[PDB]
Design a protein around this ligand. Structure first.
Ligand code: HEM
Ligand code: HEM
Lengths: 719, 723
């Protein structure tokens, strides 16, 4: 009878916390754009199930048939409307950066930048400019994994009063190529190979390293993506760069050359390769989930907008072209002025309507900002609008709610697929029938104008001679890395080239490396079983850049802060754990803003030896050590005994050790470590009997992020 | 200057001069594997060797390295049509993925019927054993998007396009014999439930989240196919080693107008083998392309996927003789009630040349039948017929997707249809029927000349939306499936439920599923409840269980490892060696493997060549680090003190043994290699550890242990081993 009811219409009620739409979890975090989005929101509470035409549906369980056992009838418009909508849900994925995550927030300028730019959103510190941000990888398709080795895209849409401005950047300060014409060649090389569509989310295949090996301009960004910069811990914990030199124009008409920066408040932190690859296996949504949950936790992403500012007359005073996108501007030469702050504080309600459908383009500038002659950027300007025509179904993608400005947008454009606006005035300028409204705006009233840069030359296809420097900045970046960071670079090249089948591609890439640093090349060559010629070993090395050989800011662990707040600690516990230990650990974790997650052999609640019940965050098996920053094991005779019978929980300790993470062991918990095939405790194995003490010591060890000194012995560990 | 030369036009050779092959397009590696369809596709292929780089309009390009600017350091000019054309095309490369089964792989092949099936159907491709019917097969997962990983826990799709001489026939099936839902109107609800959740689009390629199990707990019809996917059927070893089913009862119509109810089956010649969960999950991390790569390499290796088409045949008069409705797609027809008759053999022997052109753009639909086959009143099947053509209008850019080469039939196809986006064919005759201006050609075909006709099945009822009372049996077949599993398989089913429900945040959803399990089997529920911290009540443990199905309480065919073969040939073995390995041991191992058709892969601490203790060099297949134990069926460690010495200082090499032990795989150690094993935290060598001093002797014992697929007796000890 009740079994029968499940296949009959459902007219009755059917009804620690889960991830929810932003409106449910953070309705108090608001901005002008979110308020505009409210018109498009739906509340089905108390509402009837209906067709798209508003007809109430009586039976959402059955097709209309000729009898209860009959043939389905063509006249069932409810079924056919429902299936038809489902059949056409998918729209094309982005050609690059298909895999991504979005969030709403706001931006505030610290003080007016009127000296350098007229841009409205950089004028008034009391203004909160809404933003939408999409973070992404680059190579993989929509379903690929978050923690791959890749460049990360970083697109910010600023909804200003004078127009929508898009800052479309990456998490490294250079790009792989100099001229936009090479973009389809580069992408095709890195993308899955065209016969078999293998491999997904990896540059570790023949066609990528083939292209690198024939295009030395790529080596600089290659050095960045082979470093640990290629596997960030979190979108909250990486830097951001617009890469291109833009222009800033002030009210006098003065032009400064500009480069954009995002500097994260939560520090710059990365995974290690072994850990990252494991994580694509156990949580392919790790970065998306982490960002969603950090917003729900209150650990809101925060980044400072910075600018490198170069007066126009200084354009030619560097050992590199500032118009060359494979070159960075060292912060030792030109420092980054932090001019504003961006806070991400609201998750979307519907991923598809907002994150999937958002459209960003570098050509979406506003008055006060202008383009430079960087030949990569000039090609990008054409591409973003053109691509949206098929991705979002036509030329009205700006009417999709996430893409609408919050300022007015009157013009004489009309029609196109899915036109929402209804115009009733003259569709041509100049007209007199409507007295020529809307009207052109004079530059002094905010009408956009291009800065009158001089143009002198001949029409030609030619790479500028000032662009032909491929190895100096790669060498500078290499020399600025710490020695652990240098080894991970070597491990990156060696693991990736190890998956290239054609040996001559491997040898050709190593040969390129000999023009950057000889021991870099030697170390990769050794790993690949390649004998370097002596001619190769003495290949000439580039000189210093404006008297510079290292730049501290290019190193993650030596040049940037590591933040304790918002990190995650696994607490391994079973029934019989000491309840007061757990309380003291949690209270300490919280004091520093760290999140303790109780992982146990079963979900639900575990019972402490004191008899109190403790709510579990997930199973050990379901939440491996790669998902947390550190591991702590509280005391309790029955718990420890249960964990020593558990292969996963023992493995949890071995793996966290191999991944250089902090491990805290209370009392009898040390027994567990001692029973394992692990060396004796080091600076990262915190052992204590007092829970509070142990936790404070454990938190201090976490501040260092990883126990780098353990790395040599870690390679001998069977885990 | 060579550096400048890389940013200027490339007018000279780039290939290295003449001083383990890579995967290649099938035309490159297997051009002698041919069929009528590949020959048809040959017209659309292109050889660029010696050809100039050109625009799509045919204009030679002089400088593919630079945009046209005002000076070498100037602004890019709008008049650069070469740039704009190249960027335009790239900007528009992507088309929508399939709304389900977006992650898939395809291969070309051919089908051959064993004996004429004329006594059951007129379908031309089942008439003549002499004919080789070309096929294209696309395997897939279901839930995930295009970039999702191969070895997830999911149902696998299996669609086969038969290019028959009287029409293209699509058999569109899955790797389990039932589906989750009874009526197609539920399909968007079910799919929305299993797909990533709409606020955050989490999770990818997993049913382990709240909305899926929310739906399951409220729709008990889903429980049969959920048992299948929670079992190890949901994580197959290889597309070459799973079964396939059309699921629906179809009809077959002979020349005499007789109708027989049928169910399609695919039986793999390489047997039915599955991964285990911990392995499958590790595999998605270290190779998301595992099945795609495996299939492609199996064809290049000549281990052609081979499958026998099977038919369950039920006479019209027998329709109502079963304790289930044969029109119910949550019901299987037990093979001990109705046997499966093998009637033909399909072999896949050529990989595509271009994945996008062939595999991505292929369109399959269950509405694409041929004369001799008809539909039944299965209400899931009926709804599917509308959906496949409709979806393809937007996915493939319009209603001429049948003109895309991979979709074209190999027979004639004249009709009065015209126009539509990207019309390739040029018509010059009357576009209506009847016409006299071209004498009514093309013309309708009489049924006795092969014109399609629907078999006149009686139709009697009332227009209504109602679930048939004969469909309301949700627990008998899940119980049947459960009781037919061995204890090992039963345990893995419990682990699948427990792992998945462990990731369900809302606890009432976990408890409602466990409650549903008490109506299937009380020990099933209890074990899952224990793993979820759920205390079952006395009333729950005395919930009534259903009775046997036409006298059956167990069916041997429903068990993967008790009712199906394991095949040694095409399996992969890791051979772990470093510098100083006993070269003759590797040689005698390799030849013993080649003897049984097993592939040995030498994995070392570095790619290139290792040198044996004898002094000779051995080309290696890749690094231990880059090729962990989840990627192979078994592991063997040859002798050589220097090689063993190196491996025992290699953390990955030691973990290789530990992991392969925990994943119940066969391990062969020769001479001092056992010293590596003793140093690890592993017990008394069991039946699945082979130890011998002489290499050829050891390999023979090794291969013979490999025949059991996995060492199930080791499962209890394996849980305590440190990962
Ligand atoms: C400095 C170099 C570049 C950077 C930093 C960059 C950055 C990005 C980012 C972050 C996205 C993803 C935006 C999103 O979330 O929706 C993106 C998309 C894209 N970019 Fe680039 N890009 C660069 C160069 C290029 C070039 C040279 C081209 C080709 C001319 C190109 C074409 C595209 C296209 C077509 C998309 C997809 C846009 C869409 O579908 O919405 N970009 N780029
Ligand atoms: C017996 C149950 C079903 C099975 C075995 C099944 C099987 C499949 C398979 C294997 C594919 C992938 C084909 C490919 O490789 O391209 C597929 C795709 C699809 N199925 Fe199903 N399906 C079933 C039920 C349904 C239902 C009930 C619907 C909707 C009413 C549906 C709609 C679709 C759609 C729209 C596609 C995408 C086709 C395309 O994009 O070309 N299926 N099905």
């Amino acid at each position: 009878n009740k079994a029968i009811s499940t296949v009959e219409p459902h007219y009755e009620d059917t009804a620690v916390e889960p991830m929810m739409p932003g409106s449910d979890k953070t309705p108090k975090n608001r901005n002008e754009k979110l308020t505009q989005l409210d018109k498009f929101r739906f509340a089905p509470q108390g509402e009837s199930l209906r067709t798209n035409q508003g007809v109430k549906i009586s039976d959402n369980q059955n097709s209309l048939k000729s009898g209860a056992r009959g043939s389905t009838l063509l006249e069932d418009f409810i079924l056919r409307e429902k299936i038809t909508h489902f059949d056409h849900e998918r729209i094309p994925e982005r050609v690059v950066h298909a895999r991504g995550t979005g969030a709403h927030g706001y931006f505030q300028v610290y003080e007016s930048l009127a000296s350098y730019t007229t841009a409205e959103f950089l004028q008034d510190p009391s203004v909160k400019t809404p933003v939408f941000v999409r973070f992404s990888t680059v190579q993989g398709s929509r379903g690929s994994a978050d923690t791959v080795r890749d460049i990360r895209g970083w697109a910010t849409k600023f909804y200003t009063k004078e127009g929508t401005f898009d800052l479309v950047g990456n998490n490294t300060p250079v790009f792989f190529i100099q001229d936009a014409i090479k973009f389809p060649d580069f992408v095709h090389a890195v993308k899955p190979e065209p016969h078999n569509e293998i491999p997904q989310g990896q540059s570790a295949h023949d066609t990528f390293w083939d292209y690198i090996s024939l295009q030395p301009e790529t080596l600089h960004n290659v050095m960045w993506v082979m470093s640990d910069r290629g596997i960030p811990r979190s979108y909250r914990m990486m830097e951001g760069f617009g890469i291109h030199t833009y222009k800033m124009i002030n009210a006098e008409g003065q032009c400064h050359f500009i480069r954009f920066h995002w500097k994260p408040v939560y520090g710059v932190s990365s995974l290690i390769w072994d850990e990252a690859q494991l994580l694509t296996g156990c949580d392919p949504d790790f970065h998306r989930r982490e960002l969603w949950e950090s917003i729900e936790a209150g650990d809101y992403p925060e980044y400072e907008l910075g600018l490198q500012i170069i007066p126009e007359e200084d354009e030619h005073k560097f050992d590199f072209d500032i118009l060359d996108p494979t070159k960075l501007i060292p912060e030792s030469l030109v420092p980054v002025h932090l001019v504003g702050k961006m806070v991400l504080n609201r998750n979307p309600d519907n991923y598809f309507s907002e994150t999937e459908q958002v459209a960003f383009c570098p050509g979406n500038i506003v008055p006060g900002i202008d383009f430079s002659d960087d030949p990569l950027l000039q090609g990008r300007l054409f591409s973003y609008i053109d691509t949206q025509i098929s991705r979002l179904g036509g030329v009205n993608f700006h009417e999709i709610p996430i893409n609408k400005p919050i300022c007015p947008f009157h013009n004489h454009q009309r029609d196109g697929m899915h036109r929402m606006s209804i115009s009733g005035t003259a569709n041509y300028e100049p007209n007199s029938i409507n007295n020529n409204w809307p009207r052109e705006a004079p530059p002094t009233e905010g009408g956009f104008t291009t800065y009158p840069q001089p143009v002198n030359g001949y029409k030609s296809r030619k790479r500028s001679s000032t662009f032909i420097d491929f190895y100096s900045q790669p060498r500078l970046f290499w020399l600025s890395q710490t020695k652990v960071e240098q080894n991970h670079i070597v491990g990156g090249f060696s693991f990736e080239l190890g998956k290239v089948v054609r040996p001559w591609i491997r040898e050709r890439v190593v040969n390129q490396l000999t023009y950057i640093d000889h021991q870099l090349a030697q170390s990769v060559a050794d790993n690949l079983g390649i004998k370097l010629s002596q001619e190769q070993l003495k290949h000439p090395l580039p000189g210093p850049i404006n008297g510079l050989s290292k730049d501290r800011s290019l190193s993650m662990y030596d040049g940037h802060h590591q933040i304790l707040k918002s990190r995650q600690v696994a607490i391994l516990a079973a029934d019989g754990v000491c309840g007061d230990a757990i309380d003291n650990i949690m209270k300490t974790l919280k004091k520093y803003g760290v999140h303790g997650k109780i992982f146990a052999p079963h979900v639900g609640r575990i019972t402490s030896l004191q008899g109190n019940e403790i709510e579990v965050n997930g199973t050990i098996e379901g939440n491996p050590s790669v998902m947390v920053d550190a591991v702590i094991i509280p005391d309790g005779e029955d718990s420890i005994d249960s964990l020593m019978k558990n292969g996963n929980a023992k493995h949890y300790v071995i793996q966290a050790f191999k991944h250089l993470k902090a491990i805290g062991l209370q009392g009898k918990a040390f027994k567990l470590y001692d029973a394992l095939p692990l060396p004796k405790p080091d600076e990262g194995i915190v052992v204590g009997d007092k829970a509070a003490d142990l936790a404070e010591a454990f938190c201090n060890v976490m501040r260092g992020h990883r126990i780098w000194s353990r790395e040599s012995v870690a390679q001998e560990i069977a885990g």
